[PDB]
Amino acid sequence: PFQCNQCGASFTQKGNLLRHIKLHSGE
Amino acid sequence: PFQCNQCGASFTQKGNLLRHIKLHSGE
Amino acid sequence: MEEFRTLHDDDSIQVIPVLPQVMMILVPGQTLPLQLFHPQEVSMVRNLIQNDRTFAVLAYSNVQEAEFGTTAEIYAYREEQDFGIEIVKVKAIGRQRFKVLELRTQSDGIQQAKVQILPEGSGDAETLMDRIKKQLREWDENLKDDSLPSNPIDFSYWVAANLPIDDSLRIQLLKIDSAIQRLRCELDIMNKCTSLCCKQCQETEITTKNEIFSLSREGPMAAYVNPHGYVHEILTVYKACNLNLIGRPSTEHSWFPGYAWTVAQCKICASHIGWKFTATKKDMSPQKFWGLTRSALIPT
Amino acid sequence: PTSHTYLGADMEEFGRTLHDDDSIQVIPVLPQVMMILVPGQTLPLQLFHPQEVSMVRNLIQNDRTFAVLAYSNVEREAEFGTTAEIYAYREEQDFGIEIVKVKAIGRQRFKVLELRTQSDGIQQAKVQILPEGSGDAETLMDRIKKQLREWDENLKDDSLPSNPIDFSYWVAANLPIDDSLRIQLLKIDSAIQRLRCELDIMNKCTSLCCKQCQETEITTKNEIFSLSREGPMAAYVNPHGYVHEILTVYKACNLNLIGRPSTEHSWFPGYAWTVAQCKICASHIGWKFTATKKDMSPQKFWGLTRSALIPT
Ligand SMILES: N#Cc1ccc(N2CCN(Cc3ccc(COc4cccc5c4CN([C@H]4CCC(=O)NC4=O)C5=O)cc3)CC2)c(F)c1
Ligand SMILES: N#Cc1ccc(N2CCN(Cc3ccc(COc4cccc5c4CN([C@H]4CCC(=O)NC4=O)C5=O)cc3)CC2)c(F)c1
Ligand SMILES: [Zn+2]
Ligand SMILES: [Zn+2]
Ligand SMILES: [Zn+2]
Ligand SMILES: [Zn+2]
């Protein structure tokens, strides 16, 4: 349900989404 | 009382305050 | 507090004093409270009361300087002293944006800026204002349209002052002279963001736009000065998550009379996010609310 | 796939006589686009910001052309750029957000002389259209096609442009090379020299590693294959506007997949997609494509984003 706007990768928990979004920006 | 000037966070131990302020500075 | 309208003409070039400690992105119409203790700072405010009462707040994009800024007009002033230390407390209002042409420092350390008052391009699209307002009311639900301005220029700046957006977005606007371009960008913002997170880890959603509520006329956001001059722009929301509280509530210097404050910090990185406010009387309807510091959040 | 069926069906199709060489023109710049566009390459775009929708609506009624700058530092650092002409346009609105969907194609290179932003907010660039040199290049073009068959044209037909200038740009658009080297080819005005540098490049490129770690090979030129007429590389736009330049290879290594496949908004119809990431740094590298039926000629493939890969 938590989907990244750049690549489409979906996660069960938002904490996983947030730290994935932070990878698209180097961190 | 080991209070922080920036947010008012009060602490029982000085070292607890010190590592709290360093989270504001170098923020 | 002594209550107190300097309006430089467009494309006019002025030399305005700059409060250095201040590190904010002031929006025209937004109020900025200050508590000053440095002899030089009090000297400056005492001189400013005697002339046109306006100073400049630079909009630093870091790498330090800054290319723009907003003028601030002192409208409330009170002097007192504690520990023989003389403190000046002022309330100023943002009035006009400017391009910085030259920044120079005085012997006292107070900085002087030669600036150009930027023009305020306006336009139409009441349809844009009606849409923004609708989206805004759904976000807060406590908003009073009749408490919102009608002028496109004024409305754009109210929105610009009460939107939970990072400085880098606050700087992008203000840099736009066209009200319409400003309003549009505000819409693009409101339509592309629903959640707020801790800036230092960006791994914790703290609250959502549906939780934002207005406890006063200034709207969902507002600036407050703590007992040491640290200025905080506080976004009030009903509910928040991923926060740890520090200790017992305190009532000293509560910015919201009636409510106690306990510092709140990120569960993952422990960085300050704001304060939880809890009522001290069963009569108050909100009972519990959160005041998040704009400097510690970032939009999705 | 190059037709971009995903962006829309009922799209208006438009094309226009090109600006002459050494001409000085004034062209609006899309500030968001951050690609080194190559003449002939198609650029799909989904615009949501009201300012961009306002400009492109304005552009459809004039020359349908805008400028895509070439940033080396981006902080605007563009000395060169390419023009793009809208050939497909569709107006759309969902979730209370008004959407403009365009398909543009790179037409001409130019040198930037002046960038200024107007009162309306749109940024305009005065450009000087660079000349397109050509000549006899049969030898070079033959040398290139051969090395091309030894990579992907093993099973790929030689349906490539006859014009040296057009060939130089197809090779340029479908070469696994970093930006700083792509801009070099666009800075050459003579087809012949462009074709040469391309050859000297094709012979010196072997592997693709991840950029954030630079310690992990993902695939090899021998894996490159074309599932479209765009050659091995093409640009596709995702449902939130992100344009990705996709290199298709048959097999790749050092990737961890993220979860289960999806079929939504797939850029290669009939295939499903799963996000692919580097096993060492976890940076997004692309997507793995899996057929959804057994009759599918290729069954599983990888579409990597040039943004995440670095040569050798
Ligand atoms: N302002 C504003 C504004 C913002 C966003 C808006 N939205 C409106 C409604 N949303 C519909 C919808 C939701 C969910 C999906 C799932 O697919 C997703 C999701 C997220 C990222 C990616 C993908 C696929 N994918 C690649 C890789 C693989 C492949 O082969 N092809 C691709 O597409 C991605 O990168 C699909 C469509 C979408 C748009 C809007 F209407 C206005
Ligand atoms: N040169 C010089 C010079 C410098 C400083 C001087 N002053 C002298 C007098 N001191 C009075 C005093 C001390 C201690 C308190 C405890 O509360 C504190 C403490 C620290 C930070 C914060 C808070 C509260 N809080 C937020 C929470 C949310 C809310 O609702 N409101 C807020 O304010 C904070 O951020 C209150 C008042 C103050 C210092 C001076 F006399 C000379
Ligand atoms: Zn992602
Ligand atoms: Zn603190
Ligand atoms: Zn945090
Ligand atoms: Zn890697």
Author numbering:
A (entry chain E), B (entry chain B): 144 to 170
C (entry chain A): 64 to 67, 70 to 129, 132 to 190, 249 to 425
D (entry chain D): 54 to 67, 69 to 128, 130 to 190, 249 to 425
Quote the original article:
The ubiquitin E3 ligase cereblon (CRBN) is the target of therapeutic drugs thalidomide and lenalidomide and is recruited by most targeted protein degraders (PROTACs and molecular glues) in clinical development. CRBN consists of an unstructured N-terminal region and three folded domains: the Lon protease-like domain (Lon), the helical bundle (HB) which facilitates binding to the adaptor protein DDB1, and the thalidomide binding domain (TBD). We present the design of CRBNmidi, a construct that readily expresses from E. coli with high yields as soluble, stable protein without DDB1. Importantly, the stabilizing mutations introduced based on PROSS analysis proved to have beneficial effects, with the best-expressing construct (construct 8, hereafter referred to as CRBNmidi) incorporating 12 mutations.
We first determined the crystal structure of CRBNmidi in complex with mezigdomide and the second zinc-finger of neo-substrate Ikaros (IKZF1ZF2) to a resolution of 2.15 Å. Importantly, the higher resolution of our crystal structure and greater quality of the density map at the binding interface allowed us to unambiguously observe several protein-ligand and protein-protein interactions, including contacts that had not previously been identified. At the phthalimide-end, the ligand’s glutarimide moiety interacts via three canonical hydrogen bonds with His378CRBN and Trp380CRBN, while the oxoisoindoline carbonyl group forms a hydrogen bond with the side chain NH2 of Asn351CRBN. Mezigdomide adopts a characteristic U-like shape around its central phenyl ring, wrapped around Pro352 and His353 at the tip of the beta-hairpin sensor loop (residues 341–361), conformationally stabilized through several π-π stacks and hydrophobic interactions. At the other end, the piperidine-benzonitrile moiety of mezigdomide fits into a hydrophobic pocket defined on one side by Phe102, Phe150 and Ile152 from the CRBN’s Lon domain, and on the other side by the tip of the sensor loop. In contrast to the extensive contacts between mezigdomide and CRBN, no further interactions are observed between mezigdomide and IKZF1ZF2 beyond the known stacking of the neo-substrate Gly-loop on top of the isoindolinone ring, consistent with the molecular glue degrader binding exclusively to CRBN and not IKZF1 at the binary level. In addition, we observed several direct protein-protein contacts mediated by the degrader, also not all previously observed: Asn148IKZF1, via a hydrogen bond from its backbone carbonyl to the side chain NH2 of Asn351CRBN, and through side chain packing with His353CRBN; Gln149IKZF1, via a hydrogen bond from its backbone carbonyl to the side chain NH2 of Asn351CRBN, and side chain contacts with Tyr355CRBN; and Cys150IKZF1, via a hydrogen bond from the backbone carbonyl to the side chain NH of Trp400CRBN. In our structure, Cys150IKZF1 is not within hydrogen bonding distance of His397CRBN, unlike the cryo-EM structure.
